[PDB]
Amino acid sequence: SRRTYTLTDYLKSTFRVKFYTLQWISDHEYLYKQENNILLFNAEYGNSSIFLENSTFDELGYSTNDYSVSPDRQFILFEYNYVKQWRHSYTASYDIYDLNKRQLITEERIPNNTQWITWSPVGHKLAYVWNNDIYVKNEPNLSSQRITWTGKENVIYNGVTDWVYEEEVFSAYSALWWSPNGTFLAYAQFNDTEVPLIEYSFYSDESLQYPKTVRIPYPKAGAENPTVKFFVVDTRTLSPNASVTSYQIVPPASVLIGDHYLCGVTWVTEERISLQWIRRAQNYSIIDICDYDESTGRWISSVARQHIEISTTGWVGRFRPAEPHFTSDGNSFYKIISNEEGYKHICHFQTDKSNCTFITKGAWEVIGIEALTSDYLYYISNEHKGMPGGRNLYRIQLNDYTKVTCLSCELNPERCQYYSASFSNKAKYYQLRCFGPGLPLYTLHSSSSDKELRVLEDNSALDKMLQDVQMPSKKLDVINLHGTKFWYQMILPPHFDKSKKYPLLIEVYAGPCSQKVDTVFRLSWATYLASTENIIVASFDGRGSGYQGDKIMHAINRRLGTFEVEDQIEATRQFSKMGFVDDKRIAIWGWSYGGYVTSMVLGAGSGVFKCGIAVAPVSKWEYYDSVYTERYMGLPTPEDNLDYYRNSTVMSRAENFKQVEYLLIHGTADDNVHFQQSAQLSKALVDAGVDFQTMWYTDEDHGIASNMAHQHIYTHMSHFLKQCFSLP
Amino acid sequence: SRRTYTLTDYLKSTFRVKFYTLQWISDHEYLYKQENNILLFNAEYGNSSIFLENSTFDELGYSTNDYSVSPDRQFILFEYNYVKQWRHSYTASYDIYDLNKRQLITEERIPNNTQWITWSPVGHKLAYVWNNDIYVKNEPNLSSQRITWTGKENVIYNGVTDWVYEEEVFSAYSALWWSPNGTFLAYAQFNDTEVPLIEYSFYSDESLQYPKTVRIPYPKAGAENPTVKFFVVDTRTLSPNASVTSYQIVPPASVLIGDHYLCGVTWVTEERISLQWIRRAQNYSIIDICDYDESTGRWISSVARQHIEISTTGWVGRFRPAEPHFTSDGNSFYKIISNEEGYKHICHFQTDKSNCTFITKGAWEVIGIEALTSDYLYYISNEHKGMPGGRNLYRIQLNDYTKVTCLSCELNPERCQYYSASFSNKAKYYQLRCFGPGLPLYTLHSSSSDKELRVLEDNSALDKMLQDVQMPSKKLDVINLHGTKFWYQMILPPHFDKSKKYPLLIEVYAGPCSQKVDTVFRLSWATYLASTENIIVASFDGRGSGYQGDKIMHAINRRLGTFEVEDQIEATRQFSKMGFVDDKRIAIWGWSYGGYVTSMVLGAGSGVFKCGIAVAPVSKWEYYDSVYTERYMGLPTPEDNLDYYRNSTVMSRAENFKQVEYLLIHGTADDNVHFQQSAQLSKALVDAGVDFQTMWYTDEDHGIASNMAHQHIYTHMSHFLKQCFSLP
Ligand SMILES: *[C@@H]1O[C@H](CO)[C@@H](O[C@@H]2O[C@H](CO)[C@@H](O[C@@H]3O[C@H](CO)[C@@H](O)[C@H](O)[C@@H]3O)[C@H](O)[C@H]2NC(C)=O)[C@H](O)[C@H]1NC(C)=O
Ligand SMILES: *[C@@H]1O[C@H](CO)[C@@H](O[C@@H]2O[C@H](CO)[C@@H](O)[C@H](O)[C@H]2NC(C)=O)[C@H](O)[C@H]1NC(C)=O
Ligand SMILES: *[C@@H]1O[C@H](CO)[C@@H](O[C@@H]2O[C@H](CO)[C@@H](O)[C@H](O)[C@H]2NC(C)=O)[C@H](O)[C@H]1NC(C)=O
Ligand SMILES: *[C@@H]1O[C@H](CO)[C@@H](O[C@@H]2O[C@H](CO)[C@@H](O)[C@H](O)[C@H]2NC(C)=O)[C@H](O)[C@H]1NC(C)=O
């Protein structure tokens, strides 16, 4: 026990944190890949059975990265040849295996380079996208029926999102929604025709004699956006000799006026579908409940069935309006919206009415709704011990909003304060995933009596390994800024000697609705800095952050680069007042927004920080995509918010950099925050005669996650830091 | 005390170095720009007379960047809105100014964005290229007649060269040649249709929302090269309602068998032109002398007026074959070719015979021919004192080659060992230009009396300021390697105490036919490193370098990255063994070819150098343009020399980089040595797990010459170099 958590321990993950992944296929049974073989687990008893032996897994092409079984358990889908694209997107090859015949389907296979594929809700239909067009396979071995013909690379998307909807509006590649019983298949169609193209070089493998130019339809603040169309297809008439039967649903008049987005799709019943649209502005979204008319095939909507959500201080929801949770009969629904006091809370809605009733209230927020039986409502919130960085499972009794109980609060009060859950089909069971403050813990529960049932994964192996290495200690706490109570966290080195003055590192994100202060357990770069380098690392959630109410979160509305930056400075000061902090050796580092924030801090000329590192940071908001940017800044026009766009650019503070040591990093293949941003920033600094450091990473993207790149960037930021702090 | 040459001194050019630029315009007169007036000096006596008062430039309203007066002296050409392109190309706006009526022509003006323009050799005709098409204009007040219609950006070039031709064949953008009396206008056409495109990003100004992508047809090793065609236009029939009368001259069959290049054009008489072509391989060139047949308009070529030049030991010429110099009647010409001992001397050719007579011989070389009257032939060679790093003007007698005078050797033996000259028309007078080792001295001479009419400029001023400053000393000497003596130079700090031990910095280029060791006076970065940082900065010309015969020059033929790199390490070793050298602190740096060698050396794992810096280096020969690369390496095919193409890349030595401190720099808008080269090297290094330093420069090209960039890079390099040498 005379060794520490080294840099290599971090980069090689020599300390394995185990998890437990399962899939609910019934209301009490779940699948679990063990020793390379799926097993069916019976939640009620704990007894399992082989659902698919390993061996049967014959490295088809490469490796079986993912599998999905049809709902009737007659077939299982195998995914191989996975080729990542953006953040959620990717292509792959797919095999379908017959669990009856126990053979592999060989006639009529799924196309190579498939973009998205999915079993229908019931039975074993399949819907999939390929070359931006949709295809429906009722039966596996049979042929597939093409549903669209407009698909075109980089221009028209049927069933899958383009770059901006994938990154900022759905957070997923898919834009396909089967009806509850497989009758209808809904999809979105995207048109990127007038969206400008972002282009950059991809050098590829050393042997390529000429670099390639990657081209992506990418709308930057204020530029032409992709347009959208929604379609509902009746798969009943899908026939090789038949036209396709589909109805196009348009947005209510209030959104249809100017530019807009489609932010959500939720089937209520085989004949009732809920669409949620939001305006480009984003301080006005609306739910439109549409019902099928059996006599015309049309899908009708109406005023009685529309619900408008707006914001006067900013944008709707956290990163999009929260999703509606309908009751089985679909006549009412539950959904999180801001308070009269700005706290996110569950309101109960009537499908054909306009008034709603909150069933939760308090100086805390509801993170999300987890399940909804005819009796209870299961959700997750940060109310416990009033700390916003905590997560717990609650169950509220629908006939008495007073009868609210906490299922995770007391299970392991010290080790578990941050949870997420996975409910079984009817909410008879759930798995409780504890991500911290102690080692992660996975357990299974019965909804009937709320009994421990059993433990799925306690990371007892990890714990064993750690008590033979000097780990850092992390403490959460509050500090006061301009009246408001704010949270912070410090990763303190081992053998904490208060008489000693320790160099301090601020690890910062600080983007709207962000939260860098929580109880999640993490084995990170800071672990190594605290443990081995004896550097205290801290984080602060100030104005603009989230899960604390709109007042705090909407604070930076239309003025990014201001309060959240200042607040980091103001808080580091207090941190420097303390005695174990060597106020003459403090740095600040951050990625993406945090790389932006960090850069603004250094150019602030507060003389508080000695140095900082910015990795793939936003430098000028007119360079970032438009869905995100415009949500917090409006349009860059002098008739709107041009002035605050122009003065929140890191380049505007170039001269102050003459006062600190700056390390600038970016991947030449960043498709998210373009390399342009840092190229433009370093050019402004050269032009201001400022000296600094840079580190470009050839062909790496926003995550600089290739193995060698990952190792190298961290190894590099550590040398820069030990030099900024003159450490051995 | 006393002042030392500071970094700022080097960066802001605080110490100016005057010169004397003149434009001969007759056998005894020349133009000079002084105080912004254009004086017309008379060589014979020295008396001058205003030609255009600086009163005119003030009235034009635009910043005159250059001018050109018509040979008949009736008009003057004003250049403005100069926009640099590649190394020699640029576009610009032009105004013609009628001297006589001291008015400015405004009718039938010259197009903005003109790409090249030139007065006829006699009279006041003009020819210029606009949008890759050629235009002739007989009168400044008249309309111009179009000559070509095929002109097309990035595809067809008429009158000017495409990218590779500019950079590697003509070291010029022009591709047109008037005849002596201006009867003909000969031009070359370039077809880049199949030449691949190098593409990269140009971020430009901070306000440009989307980066643009630059595209240039650039042939890389072995790719498809542009094709060429030559035409001679009989400008006598140019009328608005008449066709262009033109004949096309094709190369001799021995060159047409495969890919070739046109590498030279020389008018001999109004009815005789000399074309010089060379096979794509470049160890076979031929000169075709064509005479105009007055009865048909064709230009006839004959086997008797042809002359072949080959190289069995490598390529021909230095960077191309030497141009021929014809007698006034074209019955013979003189030219520089290699003698039997591998030494470049002047051979005298009879236009219609095949054997030639050398008129100079010895273990030194002729640099180039400067002039030729029926009696004498003036030239420059490094014969004097037997040092290839010096140059002198010599005169040899055509009816007796034993009679050769050195017109410059003895004018200032200690101040002047590096000359060049500019002769008046008919070689009657000539300006001599001394570049070192002393301060630059421009004098004027009579070719007959061999008397120095007067000093045009002696930098008497600079010499003053340079006494109140601690300038370093520059020593030149020799050392032996594998049996041959190779020159080297050192810039010793002031108060250089042979006793003490100083850090050594090797400064390298070491490209084929290169010369780093000479006697030219240079106020530089090294002058700062030696003067203020007391660092010795040495250079060495080993195998591969030139001006010392083909054996030394062709030693690296087809094996770039071998002998030259190996010799920069042997020399350093001998240097380390001189006692005033502190082997615990030796470094190496170079730009371009020198960044390559610098990288190859660092990667040799010879443990001699502590650290090194590479600026815009070639890293893999298959990435560099085809003309240059191939000339010394042949084709990258396994049949040809592909095996040496691979073991000579810099990424193949990546492991050895873990033993040294490295700094890789490249300008992202580099169109010569593409940024791809360092992106690939950096990637190979990230992949090897090698730690190193990187610095990109946004939108800077191969020179990284913009005002602020220039400063930033030398500042940045010094800081890095100083920590490596542990200097405070
Ligand atoms: C327009 O042309 C006239 C030429 O007649 C220019 O006048 C000359 O201006 C220069 C500029 O300094 C004077 O030279 C100076 O000489 C002294 C020597 O004592 C030296 O100390 C200075 O450093 C500088 O070199 C020169 O005497 C003067 N000559 C005349 C005839 O007045 C005038 O400057 C031009 N105007 C513009 C806008 O360039
Ligand atoms: C994608 O959107 C573009 C609009 O930018 C559509 O193109 C226009 O289509 C109309 C109707 O055919 C034409 O009259 C216009 O000339 C088109 N303008 C442009 C910019 O091309 C295009 O039809 C849409 N594609 C799909 C499949 O909806
Ligand atoms: C952009 O300009 C605005 C307008 O002045 C800045 O806002 C002011 O910031 C100072 C901070 O010293 C405050 O005292 C004022 O109350 C602010 N006024 C307004 C209009 O809110 C803003 O800070 C600038 N943004 C950046 C990135 O510096
Ligand atoms: C590339 O490979 C060639 C072939 O082996 C190298 O040439 C030999 O190099 C060794 C050691 O440097 C010498 O002792 C031999 O005499 C050389 N013989 C040959 C075949 O030329 C060459 O040095 C290598 N160069 C590079 C760039 O790696």
Ligand SMILES: *[B]([O])([O])[C]1[C][C][C]N1C(=O)[C]1[C][C][C][N]1
């Ligand atoms: B970074 O913070 O991840 C980057 C720049 C700021 C916004 N951003 C994004 O990637 C956003 C936030 C999450 C969806 N896109």
Ligand SMILES: *[B]([O])([O])[C]1[C][C][C]N1C(=O)[C]1[C][C][C][N]1
């Ligand atoms: B650099 O050394 O100037 C670069 C890489 C090697 C070739 N090169 C050039 O710029 C060439 C050499 C001469 C014509 N351009």
Ligand SMILES: *[C@@H]1O[C@H](CO)[C@@H](O)[C@H](O)[C@H]1NC(C)=O
């Ligand atoms: C398959 O499962 C058995 C136990 O059920 C196990 O012993 C065997 O090693 C597994 N094969 C592999 C390596 O996946």
Ligand SMILES: *[C@@H]1O[C@H](CO)[C@@H](O)[C@H](O)[C@H]1NC(C)=O
């Ligand atoms: C567990 O055993 C019960 C009978 O005791 C059976 O009904 C159930 O299907 C089993 N579950 C599995 C898949 O092991």
Ligand SMILES: *[C@@H]1O[C@H](CO)[C@@H](O)[C@H](O)[C@H]1NC(C)=O
């Ligand atoms: C559909 O049309 C195709 C045309 O080739 C035909 O082969 C098929 O029999 C038709 N299906 C029916 C039975 O309607």
Ligand SMILES: *[C@@H]1O[C@H](CO)[C@@H](O)[C@H](O)[C@H]1NC(C)=O
């Ligand atoms: C929504 O934003 C627009 C401009 O961004 C503004 O004109 C409008 O008043 C806003 N509406 C609300 C609810 O504040």
Ligand SMILES: *[C@@H]1O[C@H](CO)[C@@H](O)[C@H](O)[C@H]1NC(C)=O
């Ligand atoms: C220079 O002097 C010569 C001879 O005296 C004379 O012919 C000529 O006109 C003069 N030129 C100038 C500069 O005016």
Ligand SMILES: *[C@@H]1O[C@H](CO)[C@@H](O)[C@H](O)[C@H]1NC(C)=O
């Ligand atoms: C250029 O070359 C292409 C063939 O590569 C040819 O088709 C084209 O006509 C040429 N253009 C001219 C003007 O000769």
Ligand SMILES: *[C@@H]1O[C@H](CO)[C@@H](O)[C@H](O)[C@H]1NC(C)=O
């Ligand atoms: C040239 O042709 C034009 C009409 O095309 C005519 O008006 C003009 O007179 C002609 N000029 C000459 C050169 O005779």
Ligand SMILES: *[C@@H]1O[C@H](CO)[C@@H](O)[C@H](O)[C@H]1NC(C)=O
């Ligand atoms: C010129 O080079 C080629 C290969 O590139 C070679 O075969 C040929 O012999 C060379 N010329 C001579 C005369 O050496």
